[PDB]
Swiss-Prot record, chains A, B:
Transfers electrons from cytochrome c551 to cytochrome oxidase. The gene is azu. Residues 1-128 form the Plastocyanin-like domain. Keywords: Copper, Disulfide bond, Electron transport, Metal-binding, Periplasm, Signal, Transport. The keyword Protease does not apply. This is Azurin. Cu cation binds at H46, C112, H117, M121.
Length: 128, 128
């Protein structure tokens, strides 16, 4: 779309895209996450989290450690540019962030921090 | 080991072996599963399930559909040759099955049926 993208996370532990291109003229950008599956949040919760590629590993590792009540994200984690909540089946959530937090030339990764899901639920985002 | 194998499943959704060999001379075979990790059963529970390569997908789909209370395995599923319980961090379980249930020149697969894990947590078993 233009300054929005719709993404789904499913019961097979995958996202329906692995690359998001943010257009340089967007003042803000929205990610709409919907979970069309059947499994509950405590076993297959998904969220969409954005960080630079170099920070992804620490966000996932510290996320895993904060637990389900913290939506597997370290509270006030400085490395996280934007994130949705951790949702379960049949739920939807959206996040809008300011594009000026991104800079051209940096590799960004989006991913799910529910334990083990980043193996498959990850993609690139780049401001072009 | 003689007619037995000790196998580990970890918080990164990996088993420590991806190929089990069963000797035809064995009357029985035992699989001893341990989880040395730290994540609980509802978020990273692992089990070890055996079926033919042909029935694995049906066992996985129906398993997913049975729910956490049924250890993500259909009750009395004819296709499951042997399986452990679904266990979490710090636990261990063993299954011993008769080698007469395996036929020479049939491909078998072992896998974890916890939602999302079988595409990564799987390996081959063969009768030699
Ligand atoms: Cu997820
Ligand atoms: Cu598992």
């Amino acid at each position: 779309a233009q300054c929005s993208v719709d993404i789904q996370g499913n019961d097979q532990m995958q996202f329906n895209t692995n690359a998001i291109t943010v257009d340089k003229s967007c003042k803000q950008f929205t990610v709409n996450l919907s979970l069309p599956g059947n499994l509950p949040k405590n076993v297959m919760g998904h969220n969409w989290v954005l960080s630079t590629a170099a920070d992804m590993q620490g966000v996932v590792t510290d996320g895993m450690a904060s637990g389900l009540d913290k939506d597997y994200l370290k509270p006030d984690d400085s490395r996280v540019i934007a994130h949705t909540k951790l949702i379960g089946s049949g739920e939807k959530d959206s996040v809008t962030f300011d594009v000026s937090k991104l800079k051209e030339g940096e590799q960004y990764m989006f991913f799910c921090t529910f334990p083990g899901h980043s193996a498959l639920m990850k993609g690139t985002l780049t401001l072009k």
